[PDB]
């Protein structure tokens, strides 16, 4: 308390000093998207505003007299108009092709710069930019499943030289299936964390659109932007949202979703080669998927995430209780034996509920009795709401 007066004096001085600094330097606005003044290259901004002319985005339609020295290019300037223009002197004639987006000036509309193809922003955001915080060490009891998944989705990208030499074409599709909570999306997150290529996460419900043909358009643009990369991975979580089998119910039952699924199938294995895209789909209802989607060349590997066995359940218990403040003699093998048919999610909940039982009793260490009560509460008491017994008929 003896320093309190000086504490407040120096604190107020510091606040006044910070305000004074911000007075000379900057840090304001932030609602009109203004960068801090330390990054303001105003002279270069003026030089850009004068020298660098704006360019309207158009689409080239037809090249007339491409062979001769006066090729005319019909461009469709979006909602503006259609023009017959010529390339600028700084663009090679072979750099502009029919049907590609270009950027032209506003005076004579001469083509000034070829442009990347238009991609829906919703499709663009589907690519993963922050890798998940899950490694393959966080998935227990899935040794064979993880190995099979990695030798399809990771090994060909990491070491392609081992495959080209033997004339070997690795599988380009994996379907992870199993009851809910078995670790399909966990393994997908592990893949996305370990991968170095472009990873795109697509949820099936995201491919359902209001208008007719829009979902197929999103699928087409997804595979178009996936082909603009040397190697790419597309994850289709809950593919049963759009991957259902085709049927005719008199009315137009699921016709648009079937068209979206057909577009996805055509992209996977159709007349045109798919490319270096290696797709990955996870579903808890693989019985509903279309037979054409469940076919090799589209889903070559079918990895089953069945419920863990005794060793797998013990491994999952060790994984989830690693950072636990457990006692010294926790019989995790016994706990794994006490939940015969249980998913990894139930095991994680058992660990969490044992910790919660210990916390509720104001204890810093969870005993074996706490884990037994957690098993009773989660595996036994909550067994009414278990998704397991219904969903292993589907898998």
């Amino acid at each position: 308390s003896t320093y309190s007066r000086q504490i407040k004096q120096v604190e107020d001085d510091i606040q006044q000093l910070l305000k004074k600094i911000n007075e000379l330097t900057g840090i304001k606005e932030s609602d009109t998207g203004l960068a801090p003044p330390a990054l303001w290259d105003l002279a270069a901004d003026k030089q850009t505003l004068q020298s660098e002319q704006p360019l309207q985005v158009a689409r080239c339609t037809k090249i007339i007299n491409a062979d001769s020295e006066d090729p005319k290019y019909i461009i469709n300037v979006k909602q503006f108009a259609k023009f017959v223009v010529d390339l600028s002197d700084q663009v090679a004639p072979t750099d502009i092709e029919e049907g590609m987006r270009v950027g032209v000036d506003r005076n004579k509309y001469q083509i000034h710069i070829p442009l990347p193809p238009k991609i829906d922003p919703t499709v663009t955001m589907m690519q993963v930019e922050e890798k998940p915080d899950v490694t393959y060490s966080d998935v227990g009891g899935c040794k064979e499943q993880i190995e099979k998944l990695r030798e399809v989705v990771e090994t060909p990208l990491l070491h392609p030289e081992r495959f080209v030499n033997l004339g070997i074409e690795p599988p380009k599709g994996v379907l992870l299936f199993g009851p809910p909570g078995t670790g399909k999306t966990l393994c997908a997150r592990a893949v996305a964390n370990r991968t170095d290529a472009c990873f795109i996460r697509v949820i099936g419900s995201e491919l359902v659109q209001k208008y007719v043909g829009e979902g197929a358009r999103m699928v087409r643009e997804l595979f178009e932007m996936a082909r603009t990369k040397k190697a790419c991975l597309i994850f289709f979580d809950e593919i049963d949202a759009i991957g259902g089998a085709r049927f005719d119910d008199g009315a137009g039952g699921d016709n648009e979703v079937q068209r979206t699924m057909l577009e996805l199938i055509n992209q996977l294995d159709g007349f045109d080669p798919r490319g270096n895209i290696k797709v990955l789909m996870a579903t808890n209802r693989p019985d509903t998927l279309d037979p054409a989607l469940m076919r090799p060349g589209r889903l070559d590997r079918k990895i089953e995430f069945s419920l863990p066995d005794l060793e797998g359940r013990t491994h999952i218990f060790k994984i989830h209780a690693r950072s636990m403040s457990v006692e010294r003699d926790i019989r995790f093998e016994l706990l794994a034996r006490l939940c015969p048919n249980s998913t990894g999610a139930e095991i994680r909940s058992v660990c969490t509920e044992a910790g919660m039982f210990a916390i509720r009793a104001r204890r810093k260490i969870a005993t074996e009795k706490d884990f037994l009560e957690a098993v009773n509460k989660v595996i036994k008491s909550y067994a009414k709401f278990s998704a397991t017994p219904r969903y292993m008929t589907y898998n």
Partner: protein, 831 residues
């Protein structure tokens, strides 16, 4: 008006009336009742008697009672009421006075808040008192000797610390430390030392050291003495302890710090202690870790570049640097440990210098096996290969003290070679091998090289860098004298060469962290011509105040940076910018404050001013990939000034050096794609990629260890060498002198947590690794880690990540769980 409040208001008159009667028979009961009445409300912290606050003027009637006659019992309780009242207003020389002259009973009987105010006033008047008032502190010492145990009784140890700190009398604190509070008081005093200046720096340091020594806490006492760089105190601490295991742990700490001791053969367990302190077993321990952490497979630079995901002599040299950095201290590589002659000759001119020298990086700390691979390239006829292997010898021997000096033997016969390249390799290897040794034999062998006529300016600068690295922080007279002679012997036009910039640096390395020992050196430098004189003076001054946090020197450096010049005259501005980081790196608050100053320097500064800000950011955040610095450097990676771009990219590499950061790797790959057509920028990007995966993520370049409280002088010297050489990245790094990057070898340490048994065998133990939490202040047991995970002990600790034993089966010998730690079976466990 409360009825009891009205009664106490009656006591303002009726009790004073009892004290107004001539006879003393009514004086004692009324005064004692008032003294107990003060305690009546003192029983509640918030409750204070508001009626006595109206008795403050009533002291006029009581003025004669406490002043005008005998002090037996009349003034005794009369003055104490005035003292309790004086807690309310300013109390300048009052609240102390009546407690001093009045009753001298137990202090806490008058309240915790009252005694807190009294202690604050004691410090305030102690500052006022002059020498002639030494006969005024007789009661003051008694008050402090009673206040300190009272503060420690009610867990108010930190408040006690301020009291002796203000009066500059912390010395008696060690007398009254109990076993329940030594850790807290020592922790608070050590946390305070980073901000108090000299001589209170050493005073606080020695006081906490004495407290630790009294309690036989030998490892932390040794840490504290190492913070004091008191070699005599290091020796005394090491030989005072009788526990062999504690001495082994302390030897591990000394070996990590780079401090070595010459023990006596009479000392028990001399052999193993010397081996621990010499880090001869560092290579085997590192390889055992890597085998446990299944990372022994070599990594080709292609796996780092990842060119298959991307939608020349310089290229080959950059790739050799990447191969050396990624596989550092692993002993295996698919590119040079195989038949590397094709690869090594794929490089051209001075590239062959670094590439062959890079072959020494994979064999770091492995002297016996490393020289066995150097020998093959030692006999190469090409001028560059032999000297590159010579420098690889010192790189291999760097960080490990061999009893029979191999590097000196292999490099002595080439420091006066006619070819300047064989020389260049030999001095640099010798400097790396014997960094932080102050070995008189090596220095005497090396020193005449600087004065040799055949020695070029490049050679002279390399010799200065080496001799500084051997004698870093030692204030060696011989090295200082010869460096001064070399500096003033050169012509003014000769000093225009940037290799002369290395001459002060070694001089600066000589007095690294010494402080105010440079005034003679500065006076000597005053006679040197300009603008080299300003450069040299700035360099040596900064190196002297390295890692001190002296805001005055930072103010001087900012004044140097203030006046900008419309290059040639402005060279020392970059040194000042680097010096802001070199001084502010000591403590976290200063570094985070200096980050804003670096931003302002980048914003308002001139090119030469802003060409060094990335180097300052790299120095202040090396191996610490915090996102703010990474984003700041990324904003200037594609800078208009090429030098700013090169420095920003290299600083991005150094900041995440050894961190294996995925985000930084993505940024570096994107920069490599962006800078594909710029050979210099692409080379810098490859260097950054190599640094980011240094030692496959198991090595750090941070100069601070022991919970970021101990500065490694050798690491600082290596980082300083590389960064100061980067002030002329166009001519030194991108030129023919890229071998100076191997100075980073001096700063390579493993981010380690290896738990050993009492017989030094590995001992896997469950531990919790998480971001360090400041535990100053808050009492009881506060958690020192947040967001932690449980791993087996052979785990790599990131920057700012502490580790605490998960269970209590083992007791650590030292509180700091970094590097090699010895664990002992806990007697309480399994009771």
């Amino acid at each position: 008006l409360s009825e009891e409040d009205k009664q106490l208001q009656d006591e303002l008159e009726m009790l004073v009336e009892r004290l107004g009667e001539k006879d003393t028979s009514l004086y004692r009961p009324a005064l004692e009742e008032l003294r107990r009445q003060i305690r009546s409300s003192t029983t509640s912290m918030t409750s204070v008697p508001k009626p006595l606050k109206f008795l403050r003027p009533h002291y006029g009637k009581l003025k004669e009672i406490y002043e005008n006659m005998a002090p037996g019992e009349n003034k005794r309780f009369a003055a104490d009421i005035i003292s309790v009242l004086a807690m309310t207003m300013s109390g300048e020389r009052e609240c102390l006075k009546y407690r001093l002259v009045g009753s001298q009973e137990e202090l806490a009987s008058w309240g915790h808040e009252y005694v807190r105010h009294l202690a604050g006033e004691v410090a305030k008047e102690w500052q006022e008192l002059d020498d002639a008032e030494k006969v005024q502190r007789e009661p003051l010492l008694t008050l402090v000797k009673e206040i300190v145990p009272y503060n420690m009784a009610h867990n108010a140890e930190h408040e006690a610390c301020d009291l002796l700190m203000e009066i500059e009398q912390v010395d008696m604190l060690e007398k009254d430390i109990d076993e329940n509070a030594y850790a807290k008081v020592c922790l608070y005093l050590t946390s305070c030392v980073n901000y108090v200046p000299e001589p209170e720096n050493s005073a606080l340091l020695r006081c906490a050291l004495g407290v630790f020594r009294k309690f036989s806490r030998f490892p932390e006492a040794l840490r504290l003495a190492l913070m004091l760089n008191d070699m005599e105190l290091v020796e005394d601490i090491f030989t005072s302890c009788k526990d062999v295991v504690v001495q082994k742990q302390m030897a591990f700490m000394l070996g990590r710090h780079g401090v070595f001791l010459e023990l006596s053969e009479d000392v028990e367990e001399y052999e193993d202690l010397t081996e621990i302190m010499s880090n001869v077993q560092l290579n085997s321990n590192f390889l055992a870790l890597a085998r446990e952490l299944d990372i022994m497979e070599p990594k080709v630079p292609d796996d780092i570049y990842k060119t298959h995901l991307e939608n020349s002599a310089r290229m080959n040299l950059a790739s050799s640097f990447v191969n050396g950095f990624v596989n550092a201290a692993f002993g295996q590589d698919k590119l040079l440990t195989d038949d590397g002659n094709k690869w090594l000759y794929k490089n051209k001119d001075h590239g062959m210098l670094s590439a062959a020298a890079s072959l020494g990086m994979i064999l770091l700390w492995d002297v016996d096996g490393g020289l066995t691979q150097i020998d093959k390239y030692l006999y190469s006829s090409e001028d560059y290969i032999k000297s590159g292997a010579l420098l690889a010898c010192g790189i291999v021997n760097s960080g490990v003290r061999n009893e029979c000096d191999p590097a000196l033997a292999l490099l002595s016969d080439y420091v006066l070679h006619n070819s300047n390249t064989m020389r260049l390799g030999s001095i640099f290897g010798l400097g790396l091998a014997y960094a932080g040794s102050n070995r008189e034999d090596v220095l005497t062998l090396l020193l005449p090289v600087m004065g040799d006529s055949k020695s070029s300016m490049e050679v002279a600068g390399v010799t200065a860098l080496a001799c500084g690295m051997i004698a870093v922080g030692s204030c060696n007279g011989d090295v200082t004298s010869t460096i001064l002679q070399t500096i003033m012997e050169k012509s003014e036009t000769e000093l225009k060469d940037t290799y002369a910039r290395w001459l002060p640096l070694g001089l600066g390395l000589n007095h690294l962290g010494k402080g105010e020992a440079i005034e003679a050196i500065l006076a000597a430098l005053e006679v040197v011509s300009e603008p080299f004189r300003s450069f040299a003076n700035t360099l040596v001054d900064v190196c002297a105040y390295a890692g001190s946090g002296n805001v005055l020197k930072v103010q001087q450096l900012l004044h140097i940076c203030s006046e900008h010049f419309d290059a040639d005259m402005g060279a020392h501005q970059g040194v000042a910018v680097l010096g802001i980081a070199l001084i502010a790196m000591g403590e976290e608050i200063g570094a985070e404050m200096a980050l804003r100053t670096f931003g302002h320097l980048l914003r308002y500064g001139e090119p030469t001013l802003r060409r060094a800000v990335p180097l300052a950011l790299a120095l202040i955040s090396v191996s610490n990939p915090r996102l703010n610095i990474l984003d700041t450097l990324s904003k200037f990676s594609h800078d208009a000034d090429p030098e700013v771009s090169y420095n920003s990219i290299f600083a991005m590499g150094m900041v995440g050096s050894g961190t294996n950061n995925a985000r930084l790797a993505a940024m570096l790959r994107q920069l490599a794609q962006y800078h594909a057509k710029d050979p210099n920028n692409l080379f810098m990007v490859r260097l950054a990629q190599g640094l980011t995966h240094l030692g496959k993520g198991t090595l750090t370049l941070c100069p601070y260890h022991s919970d970021r409280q101990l500065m490694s002088q050798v690491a600082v010297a290596g980082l300083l060498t590389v960064l100061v050489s980067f002030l002329d990245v166009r001519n030194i790094i991108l030129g023919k002198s890229h071998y100076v990057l191997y100075g980073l070898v001096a700063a390579m340490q493993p981010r380690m947590l290896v738990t050993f048994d009492e017989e030094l065998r590995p001992l896997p133990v469950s531990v919790r690794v998480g971001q360090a939490v400041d535990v100053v202040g808050q009492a009881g047991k506060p958690k020192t880690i947040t967001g932690f995970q449980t791993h087996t002990t052979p785990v790599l600790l990131a920057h700012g990540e502490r580790a605490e034993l998960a269970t209590e089966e083992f007791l650590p010998v030292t509180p700091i769980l970094e590097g090699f730690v010895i664990l002992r079976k806990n007697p309480n466990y399994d009771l």
